[PDB]
A paper describes a structure:
Tripartite motif (TRIM) family proteins are RING-type E3 ligases that play key regulatory roles in innate immune signalling pathways that lead to the induction of a type I interferon (IFN) response and production of inflammatory cytokines through activation of the IRF3 and NF-κB transcription factors. An example is non-structural protein 1 (NS1) of influenza A viruses (IAV), a multifunctional virulence factor that binds many host proteins during infection, including TRIM2527–29. To understand NS1-mediated inhibition of TRIM25 activity on a molecular level we have determined crystal structures of the CC domain of TRIM25 in complex with NS1-FL and the isolated ED, and of a TRIM25 CC-PRYSPRY fragment, which includes the RIG-I-recognition domain of TRIM25.
In parallel we performed NMR titrations between the separate CC and PRYSPRY domains. The functional importance of this interface for the correct positioning of the PRYSPRY to enable substrate ubiquitination is highlighted by the almost complete loss of RIG-I-2CARD ubiquitination upon mutation of these residues although the overall fold of the PRYSPRY domain remains intact. Taken together, these experiments suggest that in the absence of other components of the system, the PRYSPRY domain is in a dynamic equilibrium between a bound state and a constrained diffusing state tethered to the CC by the flexible linker, in agreement with recent results, but that the bound state is important to enable substrate ubiquitination.
Numbering used by the authors: 432 to 629
The structure:
Amino acid sequence: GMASLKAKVLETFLAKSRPELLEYYIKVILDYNTAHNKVALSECYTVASVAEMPQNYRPHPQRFTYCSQVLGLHCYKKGIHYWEVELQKNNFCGVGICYGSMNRQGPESRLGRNSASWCVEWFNTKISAWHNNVEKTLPSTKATRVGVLLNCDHGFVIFFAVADKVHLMYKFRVDFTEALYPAFWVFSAGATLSICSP
């Protein structure tokens, strides 16, 4: 019964317009203590890019040591939330969510490559959705912006491509077991991920 009701709510959210999604807006700020040495933060901690000069980070237990990732400041276990990320030179980069308990060290700390995270990703300019180290290739888009709809109350996440209107990239139904952080990956030179304020 819950699964049948969840499905009807999911269809409603898949059909929402951008103004309707923006009603769930949440302000995401990047967490300085999580950024890998190769990740530079700028514009009042709303932009992540690949560092071209030393960032002079101190080692921190919450800092990613293996891959070029960074988290948002806050995590969410209740409510329904929406944020957007503008991309430049998106040859190798990723946008997703993860449990706080995701490992921050070693190969398994990569977004979508473990059971604690979900993401969409550009990889040699080709798009895929990832969870639990299982890939789903997706059609290309000319959009330069991703919208993430995180629904903790009903249990799903949706990734939208945002241009003049919104288009589905991929979704996951999940009965989440703990709070979720926005999460980001920037790997190719010149790649930038900018959190939007519309």
